[PDB]
Structure 1
Amino acid sequence: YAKKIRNLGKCAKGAGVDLRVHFKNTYEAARAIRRMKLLEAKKYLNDVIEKKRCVPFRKYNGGVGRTNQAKEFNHTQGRWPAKSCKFLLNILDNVQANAESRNLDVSKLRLIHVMVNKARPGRRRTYKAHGRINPFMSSPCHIQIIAREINISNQNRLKNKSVKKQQTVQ
C-alpha cells in the first residue's frame, strides 16, 4: 500500500485485484469518497447506485452530462456510475469486515487513502471500415483502500541587540 502509516493497529486495509470496471468512473467515485467517514461513504455509494446523489466528474469530464445533483459539490457535471459503485461498495464492505476483525469501531473510521490505479487491459477486437481491426480494450483497475480510526540559538551580540531593541520600544 502506497501510504505512510506509523501505527497499523489503528488502520484497516482492503483491496481489489483487477476490477472489471472503468478506471475513470471508479477514479471519480474514489475522489468523491475520499476523506469521508467509512459509513458515510458507504451511504453515499448506496445513494448513487439508487441514482439519488451523483458523483461529480471533475477530472475525467469530457462529454459527461450536466446533472441537477452536482450542485451539492459546487460543480455542473456528474454521473451515477453503478457498476463502479458496486465494486467500490464491495471493497468498502471488505474493509469494514477487516476493521471488525481487528478492534476498530466503524463509526470512527475515515478513508485516509482511496487509491485507484489502472490495471493491465484485457484485449478484444473491433472491426472497422475497409478491413481494419482495432483494439477494443477494457480499462480495469486496482483499488487500494485504507480506513483509519480517528478522533534555538542565542549569541551575545544578538542578545544585546535584542535588549537594545526592547529598550527602544519601551
Structure 2
Amino acid sequence: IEKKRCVPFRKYNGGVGRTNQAKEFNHTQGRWPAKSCKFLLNILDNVQANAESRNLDVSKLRLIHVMVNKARPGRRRTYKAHGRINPFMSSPCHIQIIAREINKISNQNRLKNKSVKKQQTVQ
C-alpha cells in the first residue's frame, strides 16, 4: 500500500509498465493496487480472529488455500457518438482463505532358482 514493494503482474499484464521493484521477483512488470490489498487484509484479520477463538498459535499458521472467483457484474451505461449507447459494466469477485498449523514378493520357484544362479555367476 505504501509503495515500498510491488506485486508482479504475470498473467493480466498487457500494457503494464516496467518497474524498479520487480527485480526482487525476477520479473519486469509490477504495480501497487491498494484496494485489493485492503480487501484482502480485512479477510486476513477475520481469519486470525477466528483462529484465536479455537486455541491455535498464530506464529505457526501457513496459507494453504487462497482462491479468487469472479461474481455477477453490475450494470451502467455510457453515451457514444451518433446517438448510441454501450455498456459500462463492473467486475466483482469472491474470496476464500484457509490457514493451518505446520510443524518442523512372488515366489515362483523357477524364478528363485534363476536369481540364485545369476547371483552365483557374478561372484
Asked if these proteins are the same fold (TM beyond 0.5), I'd say: yes
Residue 101 of structure 1: how far off its partner (Å):
1.2
Q: Aligned residues: percent identity?
A: 100
Task: Choose between structure 1 and 2 for higher RCO, CA contacts under 8 A separated by at least 6 residues.
Answer: 1
Residue 162 of structure 1: how far off its partner (Å):
2.8
Gap runs ≥5 in structure 2? none
SS at match of 1:94: helix
Distance 1:130 1:156, change over 3 A: farther
Structure with more strand by fraction: 2
Deviations 1:83-120 (A, max 9, x none): 00100011111111111111111111111110000111
- Residue 38 of structure 2 corresponds to 86
Deviations 1:93-152 (A, max 9, x none): 111111111111111111111000011111111222222221111111000111111115
Residue 168 of structure 1: how far off its partner (Å):
3.0
List, as ranges, runs of 4+ consecutive aligned residues in structure 1 with deviation greater than 6 Å.
none
Higher-Rg structure is 2
SS at match of 1:148: strand
Distance 1:131 1:50, change over 3 A: same
Distance 1:131 1:109, change over 3 A: same
Distance 1:60 1:163, change over 3 A: farther
Distance 1:110 1:156, change over 3 A: same
Residue 154 of structure 1: how far off its partner (Å):
4.2
Distance 1:137 1:105, change over 3 A: same
Gap runs ≥5 in structure 1? 1-48
SS at match of 1:160: helix
